[PDB]
Structure formats: structure tokens, C-alpha cells
Amino acid sequence: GVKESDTGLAPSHLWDIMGDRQRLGEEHPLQVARCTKIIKKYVINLKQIAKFVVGLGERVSPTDIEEGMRVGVDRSKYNIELPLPPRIDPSVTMMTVE
């Protein structure tokens, strides 16, 4: 075929059936946001600049949600799903980890 190919076209057949199960599941998309204030409830800010007060996901304890932390929220009614590792600057200083 050699159109929309980027692999050895042998492990991508099996990968093709695996991606159908991930497309049906909503592990993604998760819109990436960041916390601004924990309210003993959270004050989330989206990147498209519009702020929301959200609840809590059934995936995670509230112990793991911290100040300023990057968090993924639902595509629809915004709810905190998964904590993420911080820092968006890493793209010059990540290049020098030897």
C-alpha cells in the first residue's frame, strides 16, 4: 500500500485491533488543565481560558491532587480524572539530560 504507513507493516495489524478498543474507551480525550486553588472541590483553569469548579473522579484519592498541578478533565462535564507530572517548560532543559 505505502499510504498512511509508518511501521514495518507486521506488528501494526495487531495494533489496528488494539486501537479500536482505545477509541471506544474514554481514557482519551482528556482536556489538560491546571489547578489554581484547592477548596476544602477545586478551581480548575482550562487552556482556552474559562474557569470551572469541579468535583472528584472515582479513579483517584483526593490526597494526590496538589497545588498548581496539571490534571486531565473530562471532554464533557468537567471532572478531575488523572493527575499528571508537572512542568511545560521541559523542551529546552529536557534536551540536556545526558
Binding site: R34, C35, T36, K37, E67
Partner: protein, 54 residues
């Protein structure tokens, strides 16, 4: 801002003034300027003076 909240006190490890070596007259003069107008705030109000600001 979220950076202000990270700046708040997370508790700085107990130094105690005994582990600042020497420097006696400096300690005195700081605690005169910062510490007292918080705790002993009634003795400045009766005296009439304003409280040192920094």
C-alpha cells in the same frame, strides 16, 4: 495566584536563636523592629508611635 499559595509558610525547620552563632546586637535589633509590634502591640499604641514597617 497559585504561586502565592506555594510561597506561604510550609514550616521552616526550627533553627532557634541559639544556633545563630554570635551576632547578639543584631538579633536584639530585629526582634525590636519585627516581633514586638505584633505581640506587644498594646505598648506601642499607648506610647503613640507608629509601628516600624520593615
Amino acid at each position: 495566584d497559585s504561586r502565592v499559595k506555594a510561597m506561604e509558610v510550609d514550616e521552616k525547620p526550627t533553627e532557634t536563636y541559639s544556633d545563630v552563632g554570635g551576632l547578639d546586637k543584631q538579633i536584639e535589633e530585629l526582634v525590636e523592629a519585627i516581633v514586638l509590634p505584633m505581640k506587644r502591640a498594646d505598648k506601642f499604641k499607648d506610647m503613640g508611635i507608629r509601628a516600624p514597617k520593615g
